[PDB]
Design an enzyme around this catalytic site. Structure first.
Site, short mmCIF file in Angstrom:
data_model
loop_
_atom_site.label_atom_id
_atom_site.label_comp_id
_atom_site.label_asym_id
_atom_site.label_seq_id
_atom_site.Cartn_x
_atom_site.Cartn_y
_atom_site.Cartn_z
N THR A 7 50.82 40.87 53.54
CA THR A 7 50.23 39.64 53.30
C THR A 7 50.03 39.06 54.57
OG1 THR A 7 52.34 38.27 53.02
CG2 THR A 7 51.32 39.04 51.07
N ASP A 55 53.92 49.33 50.77
CA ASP A 55 53.49 47.93 50.04
C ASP A 55 54.64 47.24 50.76
OD1 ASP A 55 51.88 46.31 48.72
OD2 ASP A 55 53.23 46.00 47.31
N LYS A 61 43.91 45.87 49.09
CA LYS A 61 44.69 46.85 50.11
C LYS A 61 45.31 47.93 49.64
CE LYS A 61 47.56 43.11 51.01
NZ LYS A 61 47.05 42.14 50.12
N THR A 62 45.80 47.72 48.43
CA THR A 62 46.13 49.27 47.89
C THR A 62 45.02 50.24 47.35
OG1 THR A 62 47.97 47.93 46.74
CG2 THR A 62 47.24 50.08 45.98
N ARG A 108 40.86 40.33 42.28
CA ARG A 108 41.74 40.83 41.05
C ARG A 108 41.61 39.79 40.05
NH1 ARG A 108 47.04 39.80 39.41
NH2 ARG A 108 48.22 41.78 38.62
N1 LIG Z 1 36.07 45.29 47.14
C1 LIG Z 1 36.66 45.32 45.93
N2 LIG Z 1 35.55 45.72 44.63
C2 LIG Z 1 36.08 45.86 43.46
N3 LIG Z 1 37.40 45.80 42.96
C3 LIG Z 1 38.42 45.40 43.96
C4 LIG Z 1 37.81 45.24 45.45
N4 LIG Z 1 39.08 44.85 46.00
C5 LIG Z 1 39.96 44.85 45.06
N5 LIG Z 1 39.62 45.02 43.96
C6 LIG Z 1 40.38 45.24 42.51
O1 LIG Z 1 41.15 44.38 42.43
C7 LIG Z 1 42.43 44.68 42.05
C8 LIG Z 1 43.18 44.20 43.01
O2 LIG Z 1 43.43 45.10 44.09
P1 LIG Z 1 44.40 45.84 45.27
O3 LIG Z 1 43.97 46.72 45.89
O4 LIG Z 1 45.61 46.23 44.44
O5 LIG Z 1 44.80 44.44 46.04
P2 LIG Z 1 46.21 44.07 46.99
O6 LIG Z 1 46.89 45.55 47.38
O7 LIG Z 1 45.18 43.61 48.31
O8 LIG Z 1 46.92 43.29 46.27
C9 LIG Z 1 42.05 46.41 41.68
O9 LIG Z 1 42.05 46.40 40.36
C10 LIG Z 1 40.96 46.53 42.28
O10 LIG Z 1 40.58 47.99 41.62
#
Ligand SMILES: Nc1ncnc2c1ncn2[C@@H]1O[C@H](COP(=O)(O)OP(=O)(O)O)[C@@H](O)[C@H]1O
Length: 301
Positions: A130, A93, A48-49, A189
């Site tokens: 979430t 977030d 999401k980030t 992640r």
């Molecule tokens: N589709 C994707 N392909 C490669 N890496 C991803 C992908 N989605 C998430 N990640 C990886 O996982 C980690 C977690 O992601 P993040 O965007 O922070 O998750 P969220 O905000 O949903 O908790 C990041 O390091 C990211 O670079």
């Protein structure tokens, strides 16, 4: 952050999300217009980030990062709002955790781009949560684009793993990448962190490439079983089995027994447990399934 995708073309999986976001994102760029507000919802570690940063980067505007649990007084929110330049992305977030004070001010700046008349440059609000249902009704109907991310497939995760290994300059066999993906609990992640740990094993054993043997040794060290469940995952299931007889047990009661916040249980750990079929929710509370009893080697009552 060299492992994080910088564009949708580098983002593996979430095909439905990407096609929807791409449509609105490309259209807005072509018109030179500020993108409609976007809501990103789904369990943590799903990107999401990453998507929020990708949005700003594609629009070529600045992204302002912040979270609900941080903005306490309106002053905190007011300062950020005024720092926003036309077309900028305001990324929040855990947006469902905004107190009424700042929430009212935010909603205000979205209705007409002006806080109590004292003036806000048009911007794109990108919230992250979430569970989209955790958002207040008012703010919820404010997002013109809602993106729901669910767990990734093992195939997508394997591809994410191979991509990560290549970036870390380490070779890995297909079967080994498959093994890690199967134990990544549907989360990029988790899969990447596992790949880094497996990389450390490869370093200590002095191997030329990651194979199944290296992965299994790593998993024993990390305490991750063939289903990718970690120590706490098992603790959750065992607690329900032993202390509550398989359930049903309420969320608050289970959390108290585990010594953790109810949120961390329902928004962080249960999502995959439910998806993988180890847990189920009923009006009376959570219950464990037969698959969990057998996986953990407990006699099925
Ligand atoms: N589709 C994707 N392909 C490669 N890496 C991803 C992908 N989605 C998430 N990640 C990886 O996982 C980690 C977690 O992601 P993040 O965007 O922070 O998750 P969220 O905000 O949903 O908790 C990041 O390091 C990211 O670079």
């Amino acid at each position: 952050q060299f492992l994080r995708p910088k564009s949708l073309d580098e983002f593996i999986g979430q095909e439905n999300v990407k096609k929807k976001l791409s449509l609105a994102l490309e259209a807005a760029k072509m018109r030179g217009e500020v993108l409609d507000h976007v809501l990103l919802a789904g369990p943590p570690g799903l990107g999401k980030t990453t998507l929020a940063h990708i949005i700003a980067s594609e629009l070529q505007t600045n992204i302002h990062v912040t979270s609900g649990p941080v903005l306490v007084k309106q002053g905190d929110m007011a300062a950020i709002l005024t720092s926003l330049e036309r077309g900028d992305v305001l990324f929040i977030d855990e947006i469902h955790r905004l107190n009424k004070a700042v929430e009212e001010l935010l909603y205000s700046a979205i209705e007409d781009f002006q806080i109590d008349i004292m003036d806000i440059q048009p911007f794109t609000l990108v919230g992250s949560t979430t569970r989209s249902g955790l958002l207040s009704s008012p703010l919820r109907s404010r997002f013109g684009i809602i993106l729901e991310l669910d767990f990734y497939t093992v195939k997508e995760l394997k591809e994410i793993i191979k991509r990560a290994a290549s970036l870390m300059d380490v070779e890995i066999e297909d079967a080994a990448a498959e093994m890690i993906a199967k134990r990544s609990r549907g989360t990029p992640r988790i899969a990447i962190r596992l790949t880094k740990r497996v990389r450390d094993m490869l370093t200590v054993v002095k191997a030329d490439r990651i194979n199944t043997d290296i992965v299994l040794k790593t998993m024993e060290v990390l305490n991750i079983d063939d289903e990718g469940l970690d120590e706490f995952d098992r603790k959750i299931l065992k607690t329900i089995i032993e202390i509550y007889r398989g359930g049903p047990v309420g969320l608050n009661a289970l959390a108290a027994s585990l010594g953790v916040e109810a949120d961390t249980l329902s928004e962080v750990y249960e999502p995959y447990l439910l998806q993988a079929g180890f847990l189920a929710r009923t009006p009376r509370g959570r219950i464990v399934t037969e698959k969990a009893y057998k996986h953990l080697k407990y006699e099925v009552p």
